[PDB]
Structure 1
Amino acid sequence: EMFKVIKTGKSRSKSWKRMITKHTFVGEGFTRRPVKMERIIRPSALRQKKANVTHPELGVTVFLPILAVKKNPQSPMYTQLGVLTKGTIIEVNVSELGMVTAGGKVVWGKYAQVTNEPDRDGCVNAVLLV
Structure 2
Amino acid sequence: GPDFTRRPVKYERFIRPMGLRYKKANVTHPTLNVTVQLPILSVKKNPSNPLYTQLGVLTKGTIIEVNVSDLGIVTASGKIAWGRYAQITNNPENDGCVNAVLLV
Same fold (TM over 0.5): yes
How many angstroms apart in 2 are the aligned matches of 1:129 and 1:43? 29
Equivalent residue for 1:39, pick from 13, 28, 32: 13
Q: Distance in 1 between matches of 2:77 and 2:48?
A: 37
Larger Rg: 1
Q: 1:99 to 1:71 in 2, by over 3 A?
A: same
Which has the higher relative contact order, 1 or 2, with Cα contacts under 8 A spaced 6 or more apart? Answer: 2
Over the residues paired in the alignment, what is the CA RMSD in angstroms?
Answer: 1.7
Compare the two structures and name the one with the higher helix fraction.
1
Unaligned 5+ segments in structure 2 are none
2:52 paired residue number: 78
Residues 33-83 of structure 1: CA deviation (Å, up to 9, x unaligned): 6xxx94111001101000000110121010000000010000111101100
Q: Tell me how far apart the structure 2 counterparts of residues 103 and 31 of structure 1 sit (CA, whole Å).
A: 37
The counterpart of 1:108, out of the listed 67, 82, 97, is 82
Residue type of the alignment partner of 1:49 = K
Q: How many residues align?
A: 101
Q: 1:56 aligned to 2:19?
A: no
Mapped to 1, the partners of 2:82 and 2:88 lie a distance apart of 19
Q: Distance in 1 between the 2:28 and 2:77 partners?
A: 25
Instruction: Report the Cα offset of residue 106 of structure 1.
Output: 1.5
Q: List alignment gaps of at least 5 residues for structure 1.
A: 1-26
Could you tell me the percent identity over the aligned residues? 76
Distance of 1:109 and 1:69 partners within structure 2: 12
Higher strand share: 1
Runs of 4+ in 1 over 6 A off after TM superposition: none
Q: Secondary structure at the match of 2:94?
A: helix
SS at match of 1:41: coil
**Partner residue in 2 for 1:127:** 101
Q: How far, CA to CA, are the matches of 2:12 and 2:49 in structure 1? A: 21
